[PDB]
Design a binder for this molecule. Structure first.
Ligand code: CNC
Ligand SMILES: [Cl-]
Length: 334
């Protein structure tokens, strides 16, 4: 076991590792020193994260790491990386969304329910049943808040956004769109963005040209749709800190102002026959980080770009780096 006491400002990278090989890891990058630290959860705690580290949220000095195929969320000190607690019993957890210190939602694959937890006591307290959904093909994924409502995309073998009333913990509406919306963000106009992966060739569920959608939160209606090419396998809508510039992965890294009527001809970062897989925008300074899985086998590489697309830095992370979590001392945005 190793003692860490890292920067007040930094960047976590979760590494999924290889599904069913239990080689998921956590990386910590200091943008001021341009130094990366790899395998920091193992190094700090003396045991493995597990299988498919999916996502991470930082709240009140604690990092909540979702380990999808280990049925657990780890709570860590964001400075020492030491575990302060864990929640077990998740079917196959995906994303955590906090409503309070005592209430959060945890989405699942292979379950038709969203888990309700108490992060304070580290307990599962209840379940939200998704309509028209079973265990065999169930999927809830990313979440955004809109007043008293949480919106959630249904990804694997699903084609819906659900609306949850957080005051009753019930799904109160749904919207059917293209198959397998991957990810969900809310822009500063309270308009949601989601991008579909289009399924895959030979899928028992579907295989189609994928789309990027803008969905008004108030009317819960599609306002814009940008359809791509059959065989495209897009992912990971991401916003800048002012929530007026959208990024996503579709071979290339794409950038579009949220009020645009057309996807720009030119991508932010050109495809280079690798596997762009993870994406984030520094919420304070607009710097763009691209996690490249390369070939899903070797150590991944993160590329750090200026908001104008000029390379700043590049560093190795773990295998299949999938997600980022910002550790910021101050947020410039409200
Ligand atoms: C590439 C890939 C990946 N996939 Co697929 C995705 N997205 N996937 C695919 C594709 C594989 C073929 C291709 N076009 O390249 C593709 C699009 C067909 C696919 C399909 C699926 N995938 C699916 C899921 C959910 C997953 N996939 C990942 C394994 C997920 C991977 C991410 C990860 N962290 O592992 C992943 C990004 C990289 C796998 C890889 O090539 N590794 C390198 C390779 C050398 O190692 P490998 O051990 O031989 O990998 C093989 C397996 O991973 C297998 N496989 C891939 N996905 C699954 C899912 C399941 C349930 C099973 C049993 C096997 C697989 O295919 C690979 C090629 O043989 C996953 C961990 C991503 C995630 N972070 O959630 C996740 C499984 C989570 C879980 N707890 O079950 C689908 C259910 C998604 C969907 N509804 O479209 C579906 C299931 C197919 C099935 N039942 O076999
Ligand atoms: Cl680790």
């Amino acid at each position: 076991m190793e003692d860490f006491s890292v920067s007040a400002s930094g960047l976590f990278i979760t590494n999924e590792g290889n599904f069913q090989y239990s080689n998921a890891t956590l990386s910590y990058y200091d943008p001021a020193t341009c130094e990366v630290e790899n395998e920091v959860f193992y190094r700090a705690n003396g045991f493995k994260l597990g299988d498919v580290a999916q996502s991470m949220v930082i709240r009140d000095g604690i990092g909540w790491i979702v380990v999808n195929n280990s049925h657990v969320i780890f709570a860590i000190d964001i400075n020492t990386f030491k575990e302060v607690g864990r929640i077990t019993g998740f079917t196959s957890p995906r994303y955590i969304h906090f409503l309070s210190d005592e209430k959060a939602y945890v989405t699942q694959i292979w379950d038709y329910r969203i888990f309700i937890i108490n992060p304070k006591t580290y307990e599962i307290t209840g379940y939200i049943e998704c309509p028209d959904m079973d265990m065999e093909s169930g999927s809830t994924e990313q979440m955004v808040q809109y007043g008293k409502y949480v919106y959630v995309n249904c990804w694997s073998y699903q084609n819906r956004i659900l609306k949850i009333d957080t005051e009753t913990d019930k799904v109160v509406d749904e919207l059917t769109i293209g198959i397998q919306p991957t990810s969900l963000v809310m822009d500063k106009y309270n308009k949601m963005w989601t991008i579909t992966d289009g399924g895959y060739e030979g899928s028992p569920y579907g295989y189609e040209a994928p789309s990027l959608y803008r969905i008004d939160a108030e009317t819960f209606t599609v306002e814009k749709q940008f359809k791509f090419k059959l065989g495209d396998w897009p992912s990971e809508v991401q916003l800048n800190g002012t929530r007026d510039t959208l990024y996503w992965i579709n071979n290339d890294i794409w950038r579009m102002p949220v009020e645009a009527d057309r996807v720009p001809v030119r991508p932010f970062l050109e495809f280079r026959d690798t596997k762009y897989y993870g994406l984030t925008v520094n919420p304070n300074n607009g710097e763009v980080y691209v996690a490249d899985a390369i070939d899903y086998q070797q150590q991944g590489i993160v590329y750090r770009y200026s908001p104008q697309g000029k390379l700043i830095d590049e560093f190795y992370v773990g295998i299949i780096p999938g997600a980022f979590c910002w550790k910021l001392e101050h947020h410039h945005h409200h």
